[PDB]
């Protein structure tokens, strides 16, 4: 059994004078007589042979702790998002002097990029190998006619690795201290990687605290990702094996399974972006897991606290307004009451109940064609539930997915993957969800006494200049301060605005009105 690994690539079949062949196979049958080699003075050695050599058949999987085994297994690449970026390359074979080798020409990832490069390879020489540039042509397949205008305009390796590690150093610099890739057909990636990649001892980055995933050869320097400028190597990266995780056909038709929005404009980056997309599906289209966490990068606790306080506040307002006879909760995983004091009929629903308190969480999967004409009494709850059309009455809040939020990571199929502490595979946005309500109308509600020296009622409470007839925080007639209230609205205003920076959208039904709060405050 012989290897395509280091398999010679030039057509010349004249064996090497074994003093110029580093293996016992690359010796001509002039020296092997009964498995042994005998020196021959009858012919001198040769100095005229320039052959490229194959770089396939690797199967890298040593076993030491001094290097961490780069390829991560099933979970160790699912757990670690903010690193997913595609990897796929297109290749070709040579014409005259040689053929039988695979070399890269265009490289595409998850980033909407497709790098051009002239092919080069390890030619064998009587002193070592040289890294020589050889004539190139794409495969004779007619579907490679798109690959015609790429061979005469490519780029060498040095500038290419600089630009690539720098695309890294500005796109992934925001994300992680390594880099993981999705890959379908592992083989051509195996063949393509080696040119600007090197393994060795992972150590510590230069003047930085990350793990060193950059390497220089002129100096041997180790850069992270805020500090990789002209320093062009990916050193301890990662990958995620997409193919061997439950598939049959190619990635294209398996993208056609669910991922339909992904059109097919004839490029190469589409293959890696769809690799990432389909890997996202075949692990995350199911139920959200609560045992998985993430690093926070960043500022996320502000969004969390604002979301909690505003949700509680708006539910309080709608409740104390409309006086709901029954509030049919939906999709609440920890059976506690959002509003503390609420004399409303309290239920518990979800598509997946738990163990204890399942006597609360009833088994029900909502649908617009099924449960349409039952919960008309009172109101339900559609906070972050991503179903079909919302019923006639509901207090709602849906992630408008198209927003810009560098914690958003696109996925399948267009439905966004938000990366908080629990990865939300949330369905995309359309207008067909909110066809029974209208978006949120602003207000401000408070029902507590003041703090000033008056203690009792008007007019002994201090009014400082606050003029706004929309913050219905009585008392409110030109002053409307009460200290604790006014500034709070101030802060509260900030609160509201902050939410429109995440993506969550609030809507309340049309028949809501403002004067009910006014009449509530007529004490």
Judged by beta carbon, residue 60 or residue 458, the one nearer other proteins is: 60
Give the span between the Cα atoms of 403 and 387, in whole angstroms: 19
Residue 46: active-site member: no
Total residues at interface with other proteins (CB under 8 A): 65
Please give the DSSP secondary-structure letter assigned to residue 368: T
End-to-end C-alpha distance for the chain, whole angstroms: 94
Q: Select from 87, 181, 215, 445 the one that contacts other proteins (CB under 8 A).
A: 215
Extract the tokens encoding 357: 């308190």
Q: Select from 77, 175, 224, 409 the one that contacts Zn ion (CB under 5 A).
A: 224
The strands making up 114-116's β-sheet, listed across from edge to edge, are 114-116, 103-109, 84-92, 180-183, 240-241
The answer to the question of residue 214 lying near Zn ion (CB under 5 A) is no
- Give least dist CB 45 to other proteins, A: 7
262 annotated among ligand-binding-site residues = yes
Give the span between the Cα atoms of 180 and 209, in whole angstroms: 19
Extract the tokens encoding 454: 């008056």
- Give least dist CB 444 to Zn ion, A: 13
- Cα 130 from chain centroid? 39
Catalytic residue among 266, 343, 356, 453: 266
CB burial of residue 22 (10 Å; 0-12, 13-18, 19+): exposed
Strands (DSSP E) found in 95-156:
103-109, 114-116, 120-124, 129-133
Q: Select from 84, 87, 109, 122 the one that contacts other proteins (CB under 8 A).
A: 122
Three-class secondary structure of residue 312 per DSSP = helix
The answer to the question of residue 149 lying near other proteins (CB under 8 A) is no
397 annotated among ligand-binding-site residues = no
Q: Which stretch binds other proteins (CB under 8 A): 122-130, 144-152, 371-379, 461-469?
A: 122-130
Give the span between the Cα atoms of 78 and 99, in whole angstroms: 39
CA distances from 309 to 306, 348, 403, 514 (A): 5, 21, 22, 21
- Give least dist CB 485 to Zn ion, A: 5
Closest CA to 239 of 295, 190, 170: 190
Q: Which stretch binds Zn ion (CB under 5 A): 231-239, 248-256, 404-412, 479-487?
A: 479-487
The answer to the question of residue 271 lying near other proteins (CB under 8 A) is no
The answer to the question of residue 42 lying near other proteins (CB under 8 A) is no
Cβ-contact 452, 462 below 8 angstroms: yes
266 annotated among ligand-binding-site residues = yes
Judged by beta carbon, residue 14 or residue 456, the one nearer Zn ion is: 456
The answer to the question of residue 97 lying near other proteins (CB under 8 A) is no
The answer to the question of residue 4 lying near other proteins (CB under 8 A) is yes
CA distances from 183 to 86, 425, 437, 460, 498 (A): 7, 21, 44, 72, 38
Residues 162-201 that bind other proteins (CB under 8 A): 187, 193-194, 197-201
The answer to the question of residue 485 lying near Zn ion (CB under 5 A) is yes
475 annotated among ligand-binding-site residues = yes
Q: Select from 319, 450, 480, 508 the one that contacts Zn ion (CB under 5 A).
A: 450
The answer for residues whose C-beta is within 8 angstroms of residue 122's C-beta and 6 or more apart is: 52, 53, 55, 129, 130, 131
Residue in the structure block whose two tokens are 């559609």: 382
- Give least dist CB 13 to other proteins, A: 7
281 annotated among ligand-binding-site residues = no
Residue 271: active-site member: yes
Extract the tokens encoding 146: 């798109």
- Give least dist CB 60 to other proteins, A: 4
Catalytic residue among 124, 177, 271, 350: 271
- Residue 23 interacts with which of Zn ion, other proteins, none, CB < 5 to 8 Å by class: other proteins
Residue 90: active-site member: yes
Cβ-contact 54, 6 below 8 angstroms: yes
Cβ-contact 166, 200 below 8 angstroms: no
Compute φ and ψ for 320, nearest 5 degrees: -60, -20
Annotated binding site for Mg(2+): 88, 90, 189, 266, 271
- Which residues are designated catalytic? 88, 90, 189, 266, 271
Annotated binding site: 88, 90, 189, 205, 208, 224, 227, 255, 259, 262, 266, 271, 277, 329-335, 450, 475, 482, 485
Q: Which residues bind Zn ion (CB under 5 A)?
A: 205, 208, 223-224, 227, 450, 482, 485
Annotated binding site for Zn(2+): 205, 208, 224, 227, 255, 259, 262, 277, 450, 475, 482, 485
Annotated binding site for S-adenosyl-L-methionine: 329-335
């Amino acid at each position: 059994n012989v290897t395509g690994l280091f398999k010679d690539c030039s057509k010349v079949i004249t064996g090497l004078h074994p003093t110029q062949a580093p293996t016992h196979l690359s010796v001509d049958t002039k020296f092997k007589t009964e498995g042994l080699c005998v020196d021959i003075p009858g012919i001198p050695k040769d100095m005229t042979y320039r052959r490229l050599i194959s770089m396939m058949g690797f199967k890298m999987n040593y076993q030491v702790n001094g290097y961490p085994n780069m390829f991560i297994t099933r979970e160790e690449a699912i757990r670690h998002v903010r690193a997913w970026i595609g990897f796929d390359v297109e290749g070709c074979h040579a014409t005259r002097e040689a053929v039988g080798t695979n070399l890269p020409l265009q490289l595409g990832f998850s980033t909407g990029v497709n790098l051009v490069a002239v092919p080069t390879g390890y030619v064998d020489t009587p002193n070592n190998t040289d890294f020589s540039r050889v004539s190139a042509k794409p495969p004779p397949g007619d579907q490679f006619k798109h690959l015609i205008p790429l061979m005469y305009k490519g780029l060498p390796w040095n500038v290419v690795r600089i630009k690539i590690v720098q695309m890294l150093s500005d796109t992934l610099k925001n994300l992680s201290d390594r880099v993981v890739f999705v890959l379908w057909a592992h083989g051509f990636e195996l063949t393509s990687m080696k040119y600007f990649v090197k393994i060795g001892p992972e150590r510590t980055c230069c003047l930085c605290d990350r793990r060193a995933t950059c390497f220089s050869t002129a100096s041997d320097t180790y850069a992270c990702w805020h500090h990789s400028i002209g320093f062009d190597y990916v050193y301890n990266p990662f990958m995620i094996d997409v193919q061997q995780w439950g598939f049959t056909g190619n990635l294209q038709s398996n993208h056609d399974l669910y991922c339909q929005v992904h059109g097919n404009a004839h490029v190469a980056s589409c293959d890696a972006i769809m690799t990432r997309c389909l890997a996202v599906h075949e692990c995350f289209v199911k139920r959200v897991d609560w045992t998985i966490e993430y690093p926070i990068i960043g500022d996320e606790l502000k969004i969390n606290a604002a979301c909690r306080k505003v949700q509680h506040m708006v539910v309080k307002a709608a409740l104390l307004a409309d006086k709901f006879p029954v509030l049919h909760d939906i999709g609440n995983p920890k059976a506690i009451k959002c509003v503390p004091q609420a004399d409303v009929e309290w239920k518990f629903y979800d598509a997946q109940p738990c163990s204890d308190k399942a006597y609360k969480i009833e088994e029900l999967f909502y649908s617009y064609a099924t449960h349409s004409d039952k919960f008309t009494d009172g109101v339900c709850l559609f906070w972050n539930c991503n179903v079909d059309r919302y019923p006639a009455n509901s207090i709602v809040c849906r992630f408008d997915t198209r927003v810009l939020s560098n914690l958003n990571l696109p996925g399948c199929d267009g439905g966004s993957l938000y990366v908080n502490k629990h990865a939300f595979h949330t369905p995309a946005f359309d207008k067909s969800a909110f066809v029974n309500l209208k978006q949120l109308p602003f207000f401000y509600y408070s029902d507590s006494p003041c703090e000033s020296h008056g203690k009792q009622v008007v007019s002994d409470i201090d009014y400082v200049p606050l003029k706004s007839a929309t913050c219905i925080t009585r008392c409110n007639l030109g002053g409307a301060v009460c200290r604790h209230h006014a500034n709070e609205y101030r802060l509260y205003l900030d609160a509201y605005n902050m939410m429109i920076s995440a993506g969550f959208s609030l809507w309340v039904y049309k028949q809501f009105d403002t004067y009910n709060l006014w009449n509530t405050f007529t004490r």
